[PDB]
Amino acid sequence: HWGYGKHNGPEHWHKDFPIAKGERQSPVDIDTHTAKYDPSLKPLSVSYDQATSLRILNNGHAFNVEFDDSQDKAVLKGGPLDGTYRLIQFHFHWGSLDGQGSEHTVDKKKYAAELHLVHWNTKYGDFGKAVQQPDGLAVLGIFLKVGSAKPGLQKVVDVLDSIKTKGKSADFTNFDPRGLLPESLDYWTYPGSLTTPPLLECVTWIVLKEPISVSSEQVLKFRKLNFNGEGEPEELMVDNWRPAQPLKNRQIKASFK
Numbered sequence: 284h285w286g287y288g289k290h291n292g293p294e295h296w297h298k299d300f301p302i303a304k305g306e307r308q309s310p311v312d313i314d315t316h317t318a319k320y321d322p323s324l325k326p327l328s329v330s331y332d333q334a335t336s337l338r339i340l341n342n343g344h345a346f347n348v349e350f351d352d353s354q355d356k357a358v359l360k361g362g363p364l365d366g367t368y369r370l371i372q373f374h375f376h377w378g379s380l381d382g383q384g385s386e387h388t389v390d391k392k393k394y395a396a397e398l399h400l401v402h403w404n405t406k407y408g409d410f411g412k413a414v415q416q417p418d419g420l421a422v423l424g425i426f427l428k429v430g431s432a433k434p435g436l437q438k439v440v441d442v443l444d445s446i447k448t449k450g451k452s453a454d455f456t457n458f459d460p461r462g463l464l465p466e467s468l469d470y471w472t473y474p475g476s477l478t479t480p481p482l483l484e485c486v487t488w489i490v491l492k493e494p495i496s497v498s499s500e501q502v503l504k505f506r507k508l509n510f511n512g513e514g515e516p517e518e519l520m521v522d523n524w525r526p527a528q529p530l531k532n533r534q535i536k537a538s539f540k
């Protein structure tokens with residue numbers, strides 16, 4: 284089906300998902316000199332104190348840590364958003380080498396990986412409805428660079444060997460996503476899309492300026508994951524990122540100067 288290889292990767296997605304060539308696709312390069320500071324932007328509110336994680340899943344494209352979103356336990360508000368967006372899952376995109384991996388780029392710089400905290404607009408009632416709306420999702424994007432270890436990531440790294448292959452899951456309760464955030468919440472924002480099929484144009488992207496540092500040992504363990512199912516030939520889960528797409532008729536706004 285779709286994936287990230289030569290024969291089914293991003294340059295092929297458009298044949299099944301014509302919106303791949305649409306007017307508001309993600310990711311994009313963030314040109315920091317042309318992004319405009321917007322005083323209209325209220326401060327971001329990340330309220331993850333009551334977050335309830337449940338499970339971690341290898342879905343054959345990435346791994347997802349899933350949250351209980353049956354009530355407003357972990358939400359994103361403020362910044363460019365109106366209303367309340369509920370955390371449903373986070374996941375990452377990463378490279379085969381430390382010079383690549385992120386989806387968004389900053390003045391053409393690629394980071395080693397990129398974290399996506401995925402939230403849906405509660406006025407649409409459920410995720411599947413929210414994705415059919417231009418303001419249905421808000422994804423908080425955070426770059427990772429390789430340096431010192433991120434203590435708050437290590438519980439995730441340590442469960443990966445239990446979900447090596449596609450379709451494997453493990454219990455993942457009592458995980459605190461506040462441990463993945465950098466100190467600053469300064470951000471860029473723009474309207475865009477899911478960066479995987481079905482590439483729906485339903486996302487308010489909020490990308491943090493400050494990356495988090497992770498260790499080489501941490502990132503290496505992401506790279507031991509498998510795209511394949513158990514008992515199939517091993518294909519390492521690496522380079523599961525989509526490259527930057529045309530900005531078209533969009534302006535990236537900055538919360539800071």
Ligand SMILES: N#Cc1cccc(-n2cc(-c3ccc(S(N)(=O)=O)s3)nn2)c1
Pocket residue numbers: 371372399401410411422476477478479480
């Ligand atoms: N409920 C539900 C449900 C069922 C199937 C899939 C999903 N679901 C899909 C996604 C996403 C696909 C791409 C992204 S991305 N890389 O953040 O733009 S998030 N996030 N949750 C959610």
Ligand SMILES: [Zn+2]
Pocket residue numbers: 374375376399478
């Ligand atoms: Zn993603």
